[PDB]
Design a protein around this nucleic acid. Structure first.
Ligand SMILES: *[C]1[C]([O])[C]([O])[C]([O])C2=[C]C3=[C][C]=C4[C]=[C][C]=C5[C]=[C]C(=[C@@]12*)C3=C54
Ligand SMILES: OC[C@H]1O[C@@](CO)(O[C@H]2O[C@H](CO)[C@@H](O)[C@H](O)[C@H]2O)[C@@H](O)[C@@H]1O
Ligand SMILES: [Mg+2]
Length: 580
DNA sequence: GGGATGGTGC
DNA sequence: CGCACCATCCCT
């Protein structure tokens, strides 16, 4: 049953054909500056395995890799592209990426290796990566014979699966989504990850010093208020101190014991002075462990940069996620944590950070898809939509809108975006399940088109079995017909929010591609560094700021054309903190 | 190594 | 909020 192939010692002409399935294996999860353990090539002439030392030193092979006219089909081409960039080798001509294709066909499948993607088409002549390499502590690269066969089989699978996958994508009207959006985006993300973001490590260390001091003071204060020392970070030990020794009211219980959630503690603060201290303690400890030590651990000491990895094939909405580090959750609400952003700086002297963000892109997309006259008009007038919603649901004038009213209106507006139930709108507004579900009725009276959309989208999800986004991304909702209320309800909420969140994701991605193209045509040195939430972060020579102020927002606002305008705000400064 | 639990962003 | 990513605790 073994698969035939040539374990070559040298690169030959028939290995450099016009089209081929290519495997450039990087086993380490984080591929930055990581080893390439082997190379496999499958084309019309046969199947070949090449040792990286010889192949990556062969002028002809390297030329083939960088020749855009030589088309390659791969799985997770970004991984290979970045690993090669670190070795000073350019990878061009990737016309098909099986990972992205599988992701678009069904993001819920969680395809993470060739075998999983192949299984979608009843192809099983390839082993899953985990079976070949191991899980974790027992992970390792096998001997050449086993390694070569595995890489060749993955290449063979890619070679066979391209047509089948492309055919279904076309049937799904997702062929352009793959070829014109996701694949081109993959190359841009590779560039961003490789470029990295410079970190002021000295600044971070200075902050850590101050935190350790304030932390030591608070922990001691907590021990005196408790009349004893214990592991504050231990929810079990803490629970005993709070709900047994101090007899605080047990308002919330968890699976294994007492609930010590911050919102729970927030309500217990009045009962004992220790609560506020424990809250402050967790605050400080969070910044110290997660955002100071955790960040410092992933900064490359030789370049002083962090090189995140964007997971382009993970979320069910089409949004990107990032790890090592995750720059999509860096503190900003509280000033204490926000200062962390001062440690992210330009990579060159006399350069600055420029950030542009879409203003309410989710609600603008909702206005567009629902075609709600009131909501579209609201955005056409560029009104503060939370104040506007408050005026409508509460039947008051803009001058009668109180700060708390706007806050409540804001929670209602986002309810559908987040995908919360009438229950959720209560757990947030800290009101009753009935009142929470009572404002929604008032909201639908003001925005009948949104109500219509919510009813229509759920019915469409039931009829077709899935919902779609502006650029044809898809999400299957099999639970939509569940006879279990909680399960069905969640599927309905996903039916309602996916076209919103998903379309916003589509637009952001398109904007990145359009921007990258414009920056090149304009010959600007400016370049993308990060994509977080609904914003794009770049760095550029201080001399380019004025041009970027006009160029970036325009490109982002024109990415797509909706029934309402797209609005982009922007800021720039010496650090990320200064650009917001 | 991996369960449960808590916190950050939107 | 759902959901992504981390962190620490603590027992296999
Ligand atoms: C919720 C959920 O989809 C998460 O997986 C996702 O990272 C995230 C990102 C995100 C970005 C921008 C934005 C703007 C308005 C409202 C929301 C609500 C939820 C999420 C989540 C947003 C939002
Ligand atoms: O870019 C990530 C990409 O690779 C996958 C494997 O197919 O994820 C692997 O690499 C990530 C980056 O280090 C890890 O977070 C993840 O645990 C590892 O399996 C895909 O999920 C993704 O599309
Ligand atoms: Mg925004």
């Amino acid at each position: 049953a073994k698969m035939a192939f040539t374990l070559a010692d040298r690169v030959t002409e028939e290995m450099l054909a016009d089209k081929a399935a290519l495997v450039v294996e990087v086993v380490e999860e984080n591929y930055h500056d990581a080893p390439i353990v082997g190379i496999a090539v499958v084309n019309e002439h046969g199947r070949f395995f090449l040792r990286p030392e010889t192949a990556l030193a062969d002028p002809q092979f390297v030329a083939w890799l960088g020749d855009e006219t030589k088309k390659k089909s791969m799985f997770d081409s970004k991984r290979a592209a970045v690993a090669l960039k670190w070795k000073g080798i350019e990878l061009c001509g990737v016309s098909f990426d099986l990972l992205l294709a599988a992701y678009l066909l069904d993001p819920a499948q969680g395809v993470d290796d060739v075998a999983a993607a192949a299984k979608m088409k009843q192809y099983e002549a390839v082993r899953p990566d985990e079976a070949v390499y191991g899980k974790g502590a027992k992970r390792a690269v096998p001997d050449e014979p086993v390694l070569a066969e595995h890489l060749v089989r993955k290449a063979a699978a890619i070679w066979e699966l391209e047509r089948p996958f492309l055919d279904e994508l076309r049937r799904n009207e997702q062929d352009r989504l793959l070829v014109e959006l996701e694949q081109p985006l993959s190359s841009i993300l590779a560039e961003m990850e490789f470029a990295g973001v410079k970190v002021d490590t000295k600044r971070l260390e200075q902050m850590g010093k101050e935190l350790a001091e304030q932390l030591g003071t608070v922990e001691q204060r907590i021990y005196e208020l408790a009349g004893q020392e214990f592991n504050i970070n231990s929810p079990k030990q803490l629970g005993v101190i709070l709900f047994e020794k101090l007899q605080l009211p047990v308002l919330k219980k968890t699976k294994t014991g007492y609930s010590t959630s911050a919102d729970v503690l927030e309500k217990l603060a009045p009962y004992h002075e220790i609560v506020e201290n424990i809250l402050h303690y967790r605050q400080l400890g969070k910044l110290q462990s997660t955002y100071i030590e955790g960040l410092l651990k992933v900064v490359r000491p030789d370049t002083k940069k962090v090189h995140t990895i964007f997971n382009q094939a993970l979320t069910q909405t089409g949004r990107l996620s990032s790890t090592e580090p995750n720059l999509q959750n860096i503190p900003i609400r509280l000033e204490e944590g926000r200062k962390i952003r001062q440690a992210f700086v330009p990579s060159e002297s006399d350069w600055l950070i420029f950030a542009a963000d879409y203003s309410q892109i989710e609600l603008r997309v909702l206005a567009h898809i629902a075609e709600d006259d009131n909501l579209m008009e609201a955005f056409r007038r560029d009104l503060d939509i939370h104040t506007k919603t408050a005026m409508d649901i509460f039947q008051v004038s803009e001058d009668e809108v109180t700060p708390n009213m706007r806050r409540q209106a804001k929670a209602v507006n986002f309810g559908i975006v987040y995908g919360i139930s009438d229950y959720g709108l209560a757990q947030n507004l800290n009101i009753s399940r009935k009142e929470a579900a009572e404002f929604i009725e008032r909201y639908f009276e003001s925005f009948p088109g949104v109500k219509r959309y919510m009813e229509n989208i759920v019915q469409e999800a039931k009829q077709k079995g899935y919902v779609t986004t502006l650029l044809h991304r898809r999400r299957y909702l099999p639970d939509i017909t569940s006879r279990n209320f909680n399960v069905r309800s969640f599927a309905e909420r996903m039916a309602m929010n996916t076209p919103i969140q998903g379309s916003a994701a589509d637009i952001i991605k398109k904007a990145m591609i359009d921007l990258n193209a414009r920056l090149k045509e304009e010959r600007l040195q400016a370049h993308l560094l990060l994509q977080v939430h609904d914003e794009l972060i770049l760095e550029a020579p201080k001399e380019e700021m004025e041009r970027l102020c006009r160029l970036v927002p325009e490109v982002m606002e024109q990415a797509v054309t909706l029934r309402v305008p797209l609005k982009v705000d922007y800021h720039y400064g010496s650090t990320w903190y200064d650009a917001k």
